Write an enzyme that holds these catalytic residues in place. Structure first.
Site, short mmCIF file in Angstrom:
data_model
loop_
_atom_site.label_atom_id
_atom_site.label_comp_id
_atom_site.label_asym_id
_atom_site.label_seq_id
_atom_site.Cartn_x
_atom_site.Cartn_y
_atom_site.Cartn_z
N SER A 1 -0.80 15.52 -12.15
CA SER A 1 -1.04 15.15 -13.52
C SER A 1 -1.29 16.40 -14.35
O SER A 1 -1.82 17.41 -13.85
CB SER A 1 -2.24 14.21 -13.58
OG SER A 1 -2.65 13.94 -14.90
N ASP B 1 0.83 -1.19 0.00
CA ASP B 1 0.00 0.00 0.00
C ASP B 1 0.87 1.25 0.00
O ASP B 1 1.34 1.68 1.05
CB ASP B 1 -0.89 -0.01 1.24
CG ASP B 1 -1.81 1.20 1.32
OD1 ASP B 1 -1.94 1.89 0.29
OD2 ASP B 1 -2.41 1.42 2.40
#
EC number: 3.4.23.22
Length: 330
Positions: free
Chosen positions: A199, A35
């Protein structure tokens, strides 16, 4: 040193991925959920409340000659999906894919929430976010990666998750055969303890690319892709019959649909998520309403590039002094 381990979906939907991890002496092999959105290595154990164990493999520290109680240390964690666990702490030897760390904090669960009990395939979590998020008190502990880093050939790990197939986590090296083209690296902020990046935009299907900055985290422990409501609405508007359902808890779409791809930007590069990756199947067994793999982050407080996005790429988690993230197509 390096390590290399195969990671395998837990079910037919790729809800999560498990990777075998050797703990203790002699080795006890547990299948952990790696994770990159948390920083605790915790396991089902001989200390876990019996009624909360349902098929998991447990770590038994009393059977390990290298286990030592970390006296006075406790831990308690709550995840974004509302699940939680807590307990006490041992140090022991932990190996992943041939890479060994001695003195690793192994957090032994005394209690786990129902979602963990109900998932018989996940024996615990191995956190790979920054150690500043580790929950051990009163002495915060380091992640497996942080502990291994100095011994690694290169201070990196990579995630290469499969679509309905096994994949690989590598430590200490970049496998240049595992991706196509070049790797595009992008800046990381560690201010919130995550692999947080921005992004450069998105496209839906064969549509034009929209240049827009989307701050989010690379999180292997989250199944879906969670993005701003504007982006998500633009995606689902291209699927006839798709709608957001408060009763179901997100966007659903007709199971008869063919889903468009979704592209996200990494610098000037582009990663394309095929439409099939966005299908999470019937909302309930036999339903003709299917659950979407792109969902709104509104009210999470952060955008999450979960498995839906990451499995479309070869992803480099660069833990050099100035950390960065790399993405390549594959």
């Amino acid at each position: 040193s390096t390590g290399s381990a195969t990671t395998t979906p837990i079910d037919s939907l790729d809800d999560a991925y498990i990777t075998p991890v050797q703990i203790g002496t002699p080795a006890q092999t547990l299948n952990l959920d790696f994770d990159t959105g948390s920083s605790d290595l915790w396991v089902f154990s001989s200390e876990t409340t019996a009624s909360e164990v349902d098929g998991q493999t447990i770590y038994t520290p009393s059977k390990s000659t290298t286990a030592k109680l970390l006296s006075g240390a406790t831990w308690s964690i709550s995840y974004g999906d509302g699940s939680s666990s807590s307990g006490d702490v041992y140090t022991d030897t932990v190996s992943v894919g041939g890479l060994t760390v001695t003195g690793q904090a192994v957090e032994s669960a005394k209690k786990v929430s129902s979602s963990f009990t109900e998932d018989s395939t996940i024996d615990g979590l191995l956190g790979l976010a920054f150690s500043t998020l580790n929950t051990v008190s009163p002495t915060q502990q380091k992640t497996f990666f942080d502990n291994a880093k100095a011994s690694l050939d290169s201070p990196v790990f990579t995630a290469d998750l499969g679509y309905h197939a096994p994949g690989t986590y590598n430590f200490g090296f970049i496998d240049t055969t595992a991706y196509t083209g070049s790797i595009t690296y992008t800046a990381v902020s560690t201010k919130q303890g995550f692999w947080e990046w921005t992004s450069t935009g998105y496209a839906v299907g064969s549509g034009t690319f929209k240049s827009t900055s989307i701050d989010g985290i690379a999180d292997t422990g989250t199944t879906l892709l969670y993005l701003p409501a504007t982006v998500v609405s633009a995606y689902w508007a291209q699927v006839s019959g798709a709608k957001s359902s408060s009763s179901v808890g997100g966007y659903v779409f007709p199971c008869s649909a063919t889903l468009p791809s979704f592209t996200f930007g990494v610098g000037s590069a582009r990663i394309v998520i095929p439409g099939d990756y966005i299908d999470f199947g019937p909302i309930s067994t036999g339903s003709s309403s299917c659950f979407g793999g792109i969902q709104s982050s509104a009210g999470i407080g952060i955008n999450i590039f979960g498995d839906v996005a990451l499995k479309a790429a070869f992803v480099v988690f660069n833990g050099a002094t100035t950390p960065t993230l790399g993405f390549a197509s594959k």
